[PDB]
Structures are given as C-alpha cells and as structure tokens.
Design a protein that fits this description.
The structure is a homodimer of 249-residue chains. The first copy, chain A, is α/β, with parallel strands linked by helices. Chain A has 2 domains: 156 residues, TPP-binding domain (Rossmann fold, 3-Layer(aba) Sandwich), CATH 3.40.50; 93 residues, SIR2/SIRT2 'Small Domain', CATH 3.30.1600. Helices cover 30% and strands 17% of the residues of chain A. Chain A is elongated and about 60 Å long. The interface between A and B is small, with 8 and 10 residues. The structure holds 2'-O-acetyl adenosine-5-diphosphoribose (OAD) (2 copies) and zinc ion (2 copies). The site of one 2'-O-acetyl adenosine-5-diphosphoribose has 29 residues of chain A, from helix 7. The site of one 2'-O-acetyl adenosine-5-diphosphoribose has 28 residues of chain B, from helix 8. Chains A, B: This is NAD-dependent protein deacylase 1. Chains A, B: Its EC number is 2.3.1.286. Chains A, B: Pfam families: SIR2 (PF02146).
Chain lengths: 249, 249
C-alpha cells in the first residue's frame, strides 16, 4: 500500500488483470501446485494430461467431477469481489484468468477471458458437440455423447493442448493496449499466460504482483504485494475508491 | 460494530430501504432542509411550491435549471455505491427513494421506486405530454411543449400535489412485506413517505435508521447509526458481503 502504487492504479488508462488458482484458494478451491492440490497422492499435472485421460478416463473424470462439485458449491471469496468491484468503478477494463471455476463471474465480473476453459463446459472426444452443465456428474459411469455417442471430456485446456485461438488473441490484445497490469495468484511458469504480463512490461506499462510467495515474475514487477489476494485486493480497492475521488469530478 | 445488526441484515428475508436527500449530500447535492439548501436566500419548501410556480414560473424554473445542472454532472457516492452493492448481493429487494436526482440508478441500482418524481423528466401542465431531458435547460426561455404549447415543468412532486401514479401503492406493497427496512438520510417529517417505515414497524419488522441527526423516527428505530450515509453504508455493506458466507452453503 503506497501512494505511487495507488496513483498508478488510480490514473490507469487501461488497467488489466491476470489471475491464477491462488486467487481462488481462499474460496476453498485447491491450487494447481500447492500441497492443497494433492488428490489421492496425485499432483494436478498428472491428471490434466491428454494421455492420462487416455490411460484411464475413469480416474481423471472422478477428479473432475470432484473438482466440479466443489467449484459448483463454492462461494466467490473477497479477492474475486475486489476485482469485480474494480471493474464496476471503471478502473479495470479486462480480467484474464487461467482458472476454470466461474468464481469471477459469481462476483459479478463482466469482461472475462477464460484462457484455459471452463468446468461448466463438457465437449466431445468424437464429434463437435459441447454443452454447459449445472451439476457434477456422478462419475462411476463414464460420460458419453448425446449425439454421435462417444467419450466426453472437461471443456478445459490440458497441457500440450492448445487454448482456444480467438481467446489468446483477445488477451494478446488487452495486454498490448494495457498500461498497467495486476498479476494475482499465479506461479509465473505455465505458458503462454506467464508471457502476457511481460508484454506490458516491454511496452513500458506497469506490473503489480500479488502473491504470498516470490515468483520468477516478482524480480521484474513494478510493485510486489506479499499476501493473500483476499486481503491485499480488498484493502487495495478500498483505497482505490478513495483515490478515485480527485480531479474535474 | 454490532453483530446483531449484521445478523438482522444478513438474515433478512425481504429487506428494503427508504432513502432521502441525505444520501446524495456527499455527492454535493444539497438537502431540502439543510443550511446548504438555500438558493438566493429562498428555501426549497418555499419555491418547489405549485403556487410559487404559478406566481412566478421563471424563478422556479431558474431554480430547477440550476439544480439539474448540478445533478446531471454530479457523481454517485459511497452510499449510492453501497445500496447498489447490497442489491447485487440479493439482500436489498427494493430501494424506495424520495430523491429526484438519478444517482441511485447511476450507482447501479435496478429496482427503484421514485416516490417524488424525477429531474430527468419534464411533463406538461395541460396536455398529457411528458419527455425526459439529459441536459440542463437554458433558463431565460421558459419550456415549450410539442403537444399543446402550454408551459412545461419538472416531472417532480410538489407540496399538496399527488405522488406519481402507482408509486405509493408500490412502496406500500414493499414495506407491507418487508421484515427489515434501512432508512437513510431522510428527516422523517414529510408525508406520506415518512410513514412507510412506520408500516414495517407496526408489523414486528426492524427499522435501521442511518442519519447524522435524531429524527421523529429515531426513538422507534431498532438501530440508529449516527453518521454519514457515505461511510456507514460502506462499512456495513462490506461486513454483510463477507458474513454472507455462512451455513449450509
Ligand atoms: C490444466 C489447467 O486447467 O491449467 C492450470 C492453471 O491454469 C495453470 C497455472 O497455474 P496457477 O499459477 O494459476 O496455479 P499455481 O498452483 O501454479 O500457483 C498458484 C499461486 O498462488 C499463490 N497462492 C496461494 N494461495 C494464495 C492466496 N490466498 N492469494 C494469492 N495467491 C495465493 C501461490 O503462492 C502460487 O504462486 O496451469 C495449470 O496448467
Ligand atoms: C419537493 C421535493 O423535492 O421533496 C422533498 C423531499 O423529497 C422530502 C423529504 O426530504 P428529505 O428527508 O429526503 O431531505 P431533508 O433535507 O428533509 O433531510 C435530509 C436528512 O439528511 C440528513 N443528512 C444530511 N447529510 C447527510 C449525510 N451526508 N448522510 C446521511 N444523512 C444526511 C439530515 O440530518 C437530514 O435529516 O420532502 C421534500 O418535500
Ligand atoms: Zn459427440
Ligand atoms: Zn402540453
């Protein structure tokens, strides 16, 4: 919490944010690399594989239905709320997220780019069908397609796969027009997201990183808040609404 | 703070609110009875008079022109913000305001009964014509009328006049269901509005009054928060958002 930090956020011309699983952790959703991620002694990187779904669809789907039921009952925590607020007040123009939970929209956020897909999405492993669901499917019985009849999968992006074309470009646009970016709850490793903030930094724009841990992005972000996105973001937006009251209006 | 108050708000089955000009002060819009209310030494009550209008329509329109000029440029404050926030959260079911400015909707409120008219509206004194301006009117020239050509007026309500159409019945229905009503920045002196809360109260409902001063409503309010609606409404809407995360879900 600094005057310059605030002045920066306050005077943004096109401020954007990039969120990761860390931002939802206080909502009870396990991160991807934290100890809270171990599911049956499995690391997330061992199930979100395109091969793992092939080696054994049963196990992977159990993991997803399990995650789904959790995200579908979870409540958007303070951090989510703060970003939703920062967009209402007009400061934040766009929110880029790697999370697949709809915890941001549940806070109210309008302009949201889902780089890695959504859990509400279930597309086909055979045809071109895809739909949104409301509940987690009791997994014991493997999900089949209501059309061409075949195997269904989580409408999310796995490693080695490729994120929706249009989506990355829309993001490439936001950060290519942004002057300031808030990077919260992400480990600064998985690409091509990690590279997004570096873009702003290249064009001169400013970076604000919110993370309890030091990350390979820290060493270059203009400012670096050491805490949980819940507190930081909330206490932050609180001072932003105050700073927002100055000049012409 | 007080947890009992919070519980009441958080657990309310149908909460509604009655606001007054006290909720638009911190936006720079004077109240009806405050020291800031005077205009050319005239008092509001003695100018927003249907008689005072016929007696000298040029002065009264000059006054309204001046007021609109302010409102059509004024920005919504924390109280405005907060009432809109509590509506998105699903707690505030309806907001009944006596304010003729349009700040509540601006902040984002959706369900708003405008008890006393609108400065955004101009209806004719004879024909049944009535439009909605978006900018202040040039005062030297009195308004026309693309219908019968008679004098035009602000679409508001003056003393001794009737309230807009189904308005009173609407608010009458709201408070006849309301288990909790928040009454912010109104002097609880002018009828029939000052009665709406009494309705709730004689039904075993809870009245949370918010006003820097003591009013004829104060001694019957279950909670009397003596402070500016800007700060009181902000702190309160925050506690509630959080506390709104307990039990079963
Ligand atoms: C497969 C898939 O859907 O894709 C995922 C995921 O989108 C992507 C990146 O992972 P991501 O960086 O978002 O998750 P990670 O598990 O890689 O990183 C989460 C970050 O959150 C931080 N963190 C934990 N609790 C926090 C809190 N309360 N507030 C703020 N930060 C906290 C933590 O220190 C860490 O850097 O790779 C994965 O491949
Ligand atoms: C004709 C017309 O325009 O109609 C009006 C108006 O709608 C109605 C009632 O007036 P109303 O009660 O709404 O305005 P009033 O001017 O009568 O009262 C405003 C109240 O707001 C309180 N107040 C002042 N500043 C405040 C702040 N920053 N936060 C919270 N409260 C503050 C103050 O103490 C006072 O009781 O009568 C008038 O006839
Ligand atoms: Zn299919
Ligand atoms: Zn007319």
């Amino acid at each position: 919490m600094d005057e310059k930090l605030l002045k920066t956020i306050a005077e943004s011309k096109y401020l954007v944010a990039l969120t990761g699983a860390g931002v939802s952790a206080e909502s009870g959703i396990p991160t991807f690399r934290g100890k809270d991620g171990l599911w049956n002694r499995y690391r997330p990187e061992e199930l979100a594989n395109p091969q793992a779904f092939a080696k054994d669809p049963e196990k992977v789907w159990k993991w997803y239905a399990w995650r789904m039921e959790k995200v579908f009952n979870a409540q958007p925590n303070k951090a989510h709320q703060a970003f939703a607020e920062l967009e209402r007040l007009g400061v934040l123009k766009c929110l880029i997220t790697q999370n697949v939970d709809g915890l941001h929209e549940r806070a109210g956020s309008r302009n949201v780019i889902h780089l890695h897909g959504s859990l509400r999405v279930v597309r086909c492993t055979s045809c071109n069908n895809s739909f949104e669901v409301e509940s987690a499917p009791k997994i014991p019985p493997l999900p089949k397609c209501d059309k061409c009849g075949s195997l269904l999968r989580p409408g999310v992006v796995w490693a080695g796969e490729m994120l929706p074309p249009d989506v990355l470009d829309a993001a490439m646009r936001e950060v290519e027009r942004a002057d300031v970016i808030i990077v919260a709850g992400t480990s600064a490793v998985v690409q091509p997201a990690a590279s997004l903030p570096l873009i702003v930094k290249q064009r001169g724009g400013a970076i604000i990183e919110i993370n309890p841990d030091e990350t390979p992005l820290t060493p270059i972000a203009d400012y670096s808040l050491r805490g949980k996105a819940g507190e930081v973001m909330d206490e932050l937006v609180r001072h932003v609404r105050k700073a927002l009251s100055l000049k012409l209006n």
